[PDB]
Enzyme design. Sequence first.
Site, PDB file in Angstrom:
ATOM      1  CB  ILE A  43     -21.484  90.563 185.379  1.00  0.00           C
ATOM      2  CG1 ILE A  43     -21.819  89.176 184.828  1.00  0.00           C
ATOM      3  CG2 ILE A  43     -22.547  91.021 186.373  1.00  0.00           C
ATOM      4  CD1 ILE A  43     -22.008  88.114 185.895  1.00  0.00           C
ATOM      5  N   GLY A  44     -20.147  90.953 182.225  1.00  0.00           N
ATOM      6  CA  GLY A  44     -19.003  90.652 181.386  1.00  0.00           C
ATOM      7  C   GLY A  44     -19.319  90.798 179.909  1.00  0.00           C
TER       8      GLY A  44
ATOM      9  CB  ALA B 110     -17.752  86.885 173.735  1.00  0.00           C
ATOM     10  CE  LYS B 111     -23.469  92.875 175.283  1.00  0.00           C
ATOM     11  NZ  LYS B 111     -24.511  93.803 174.772  1.00  0.00           N
ATOM     12  CB  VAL B 112     -20.751  87.427 180.678  1.00  0.00           C
ATOM     13  CG1 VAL B 112     -21.245  86.812 182.002  1.00  0.00           C
ATOM     14  CG2 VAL B 112     -19.848  86.471 179.894  1.00  0.00           C
TER      15      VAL B 112
ATOM     16  CG  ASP C  34      -4.633  81.844 177.890  1.00  0.00           C
ATOM     17  OD1 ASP C  34      -3.572  82.452 178.153  1.00  0.00           O
ATOM     18  OD2 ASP C  34      -5.652  82.438 177.466  1.00  0.00           O
TER      19      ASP C  34
END
Lengths: 315, 318
Positions: free
Chosen positions: B20-21, B22-24, B127
């Site tokens: 759904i998302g 350095a993979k997520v 940030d």
Amino acid sequence: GSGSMKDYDELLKYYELHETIGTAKVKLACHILTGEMVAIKIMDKNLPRIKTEIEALKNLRHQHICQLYHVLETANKIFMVLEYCPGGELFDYIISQDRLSEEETRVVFRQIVSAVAYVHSQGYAHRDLKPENLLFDEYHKLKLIDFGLCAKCGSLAYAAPELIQGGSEADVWSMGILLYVLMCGFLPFDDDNVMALYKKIMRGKYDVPKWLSPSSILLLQQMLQVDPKKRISMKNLLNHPWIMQDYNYPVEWQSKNPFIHLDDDCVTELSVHHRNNRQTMEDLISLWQYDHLTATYLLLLAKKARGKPVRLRLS
Amino acid sequence: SGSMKDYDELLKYYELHETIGAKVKLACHILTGEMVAIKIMDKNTLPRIKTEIEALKNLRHQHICQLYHVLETANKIFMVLEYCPGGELFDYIISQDRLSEEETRVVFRQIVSAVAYVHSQGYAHRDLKPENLLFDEYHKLKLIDFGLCAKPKGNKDGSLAYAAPELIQGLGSEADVWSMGILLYVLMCGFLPFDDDNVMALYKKIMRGKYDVPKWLSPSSILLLQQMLQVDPKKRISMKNLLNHPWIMQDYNYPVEWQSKNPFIHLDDDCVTELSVHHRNNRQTMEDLISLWQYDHLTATYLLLLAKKARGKPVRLR
């Protein structure tokens, strides 16, 4: 970087953004004129990888290659509008299934072979074939992505022994690794220690599980020949006996998506909309600059294929 | 290294699902059945990560995206995180064009909660921007991305549109208050106060500190914006005065409750009881192990059991 919202302004002319689908940011979007969904790759200019992928994709057009619709370069950003592939990575599907039956494997593998044959026929080598780089679209059809390393050194487990020291032959090796993982659910060569994994690949020896058919075992050894010159050719693969079990015709690798032939319904809708006549439109379309005109043609062509009205939005 | 052996220990406790998302990748925690997000790092492919990790191990709060479990292998780091289906605040702003003052206050009080707590633990996020805020299922905000966070008072060594003028020259928690000002403006206007194609122009707009005030902004809103967007840091409103500021308390009449509702010390008796049953311990033994907070599977399982109870679902492990 930057955090500017004015960077998106020219894009917002043509597309309506939706949520992030990948975190090189990727947002889902709608192309306003056609209503078709696309995936937009957002790059903030802080690679020659992108220029490589972009230029390859301009020349490649195929039912199993994820399509480049539109390249929008801004003072600070590069945008790539790409075919939207909701089905996810082949990798995810492999883990979720444990391992694939030979019939299941054959369905997907004929598609990988379609794409890679076409790639070679246009004089390219992908050089990074692996299941993370294969995606399913809405129709559960596979789409080849990631042309950053292509030629006119991927991930190690998929890399041919020839390639590590020092083209199309290595893709066949990689497809060989792909075929085994599909049917076994784990790598032929694998280890915690990366130095150990290197030697395994070089010896070229691997386990062969009881559930693999002799037919599969034969194809595997033909693709995983450590001598690059002993690897099966793309030609023999296309109609290889394993490849044709349950099908009885060779892999149709030839592209169904032309640069030359234009579809008349689409040209008609584009002519009418831009207030031109055919010859003017057809000339403009065939320049393939991958500006907004390119996207609208290909997305309209994609809309027609879905059986939706060949109609651009009234504005 | 495209090795799959890397996933071995993970697949013990979690079953993966789609990226759904350095993979997520989305995942289910097996013992609890709760959904989580697993952030996957390849080690051959930053120290930014170690920073986020040590921060999230010490921060625990209802508006900070929670770290459940850290798993390190030869080639990979796994981070198990609270799952936020609602998306980025940024995308929601775009989808809404701009938020009403009332809606803004609802959202903005949560950002203030999170950042006040962050400052109270001796940190600065550095940030803050609407991409780093996520909605969960209850449409509550979760603060993320602690890759750049620092101890202002500590040892030495974001994106421009959100950076305080001081950061542009060469300090403190006050730069976060500036970013919260940028955030508030964007919430209510749908565009940045300082923005331009040319980045040099953008540095300069920010340092000058002047910005448009659209007509749809209320005097109250204008007043608060002016207090947060002081180019001089010593003139900038303090976190203390922000917490009970009049705009902030319009419609609520209580200050922002920033103190954490998610404890390190108080353990929940039901959860401990359930864990005791499972690991074949008694209460004092079980509680002793939980309180070590190693962010192993036990930390993950306790916190996800605590979350299962808050959801009002049965406190039951598989």
